Amino acid sequence: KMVVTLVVVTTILESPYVMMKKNHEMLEGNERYEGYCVDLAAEIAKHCGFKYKLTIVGDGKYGARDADTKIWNGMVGELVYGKADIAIAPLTITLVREEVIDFSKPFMSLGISIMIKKPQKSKPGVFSFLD
């Protein structure tokens, strides 16, 4: 016949941000994962026009600098030491992380809340006679 002549996007498994699919072993590429941040990176690539690569963080850590080694770990250490390109994950924007890398504007604002159970019917008892 005719013979011829001759962007790293890191995150962590968190619900509902990054969740596993059903046939995750039967898929390949970037279609194996799904969730909030997957569609977020899809919207970023739609409004910016660039190829992406959905990768998984190795240590499973968010970010911390030891007082002895002075080395950041997790996706923070991936962005500082050049192991990754951009991180799309719920990573808390702090002052100590601003000194090494940058951040965008907060798309999702939040705070500290109170988790209590739903009030079921409790037995009133002896107080029911004069309730």
Partner 1 sequence: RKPCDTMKVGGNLDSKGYGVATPKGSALGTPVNLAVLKLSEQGILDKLKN
Partner 2 sequence: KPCDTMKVGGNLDSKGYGIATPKGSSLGAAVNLAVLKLAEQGALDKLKN
Partner 3 sequence: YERFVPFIVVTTILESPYVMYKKNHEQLEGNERYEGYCVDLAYEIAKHVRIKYKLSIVGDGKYGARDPETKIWNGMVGELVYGRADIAVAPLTITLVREEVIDFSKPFMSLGISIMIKKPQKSKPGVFSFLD
Which residues are annotated binding-site positions for L-glutamate? Answer: 90, 92, 97
Do the Cβ atoms of 11 and 18 come closer than 8 Å? yes
Give every CB contact of residue 41 below 8 A, 6+ residues apart in sequence.
9, 52, 54, 88
Enumerate the known binding-site residues. 90, 92, 97
Do the Cβ atoms of 10 and 75 come closer than 8 Å? yes
Which 3 state secondary structure label does DSSP give 54?
strand
Question: Which residues 94-123 are close enough to bind partner 3 by CB under 8 A?
Answer: 103, 105-106, 109
Q: Which residue has the tokens 């500082």?
A: 80
Tell me the one-letter amino acid at 82.
Answer: G
Min CB(45)–ligand ZK1 separation in Å = 22
Residue 95 near which of ligand ZK1, partner 1, partner 2, none (CB within 5-8 Å, type-dependent): partner 1
Q: Which is nearer to partner 1, 59 or 94 (CB)?
A: 94
> What is the contact surface with partner 3 in residues (CB under 8 A)?
93, 103, 105-106, 109
> What is the contact surface with partner 1 in residues (CB under 8 A)?
94-95, 98, 106-109
